[PDB]
């Protein structure tokens, strides 16, 4: 509701190859967080903080959206 | 490398929930993170009974 209550922010980005087959969904974190971030959630329930400006991140979002 | 700034307070209707995950590294607060149908995340108290019930709903929805 525009507040920190219940807010998740990405302190730092995951570095490394996005495991494309393991991705289940994604969301974009609050615009009020310091970092702009896309969080991927894997099928096994891992979370991956990612930079929305990155080519490979944008490709992984497009993939998920295509399904 | 994600942080829950503070746990959510209040009810989240089950129909608004899409999925969940839990991280346990420092600053996570070991929070249960609910991803809503509207595409937001609500990080929540893992010891709260309502939070537990929502995760149980989501798990049961998956496996049927």
UniProtKB/Swiss-Prot annotation, chain B:
Primary location class: secreted
Keywords of this entry = Chemotaxis, Cytokine, Disulfide bond, Inflammatory response, Secreted, Signal
Q: What GO molecular-function term can you cite, just one?
A: chemokine activity
Which cysteines in this chain are paired by disulphide bridges?
Answer: 3-27, 4-43
Q: Name one GO biological process term.
A: inflammatory response
Q: In which tissues is it expressed?
A: Constitutively expressed in thymus. Detected at lower levels in the lung, colon and small intestine. Expressed in stimulated peripheral blood mononuclear cells, but not in resting cells.
User: What is one term from the GO cellular component aspect held by the record?
Assistant: extracellular space
On induction, the UniProt comment says: In monocytes, up-regulated by IL4 and by GM-CSF/CSF2 in an IRF4-dependent manner (at protein level).
User: Where does the record say this protein resides?
Assistant: Secreted
Family per record: Belongs to the intercrine beta (chemokine CC) family.
Report the function annotation for this chain: Chemokine, which displays chemotactic activity for T lymphocytes, preferentially Th2 cells, but not monocytes or granulocytes. Therefore plays an important role in a wide range of inflammatory and immunological processes. Acts by binding to CCR4 at T-cell surface. Mediates GM-CSF/CSF2-driven pain and inflammation. In the brain, required to maintain the typical, highly branched morphology of hippocampal microglia under homeostatic conditions.
Name assigned to this protein: C-C motif chemokine 17
The scientific name of the source species is Homo sapiens
Parent-protein residues present: 31 to 94 of 94
């Amino acid at each position: 509701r525009g507040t920190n209550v219940g807010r998740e922010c990405c302190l730092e980005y995951f570095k490394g190859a996005i495991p494309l087959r393991k991705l289940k969904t994604w969301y974009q974190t609050s615009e009020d967080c310091s970092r702009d971030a896309i969080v991927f959630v894997t099928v096994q329930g891992r979370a991956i903080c990612s930079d929305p400006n990155n080519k490979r991140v944008k490709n992984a979002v497009k993939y998920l959206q295509s399904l």
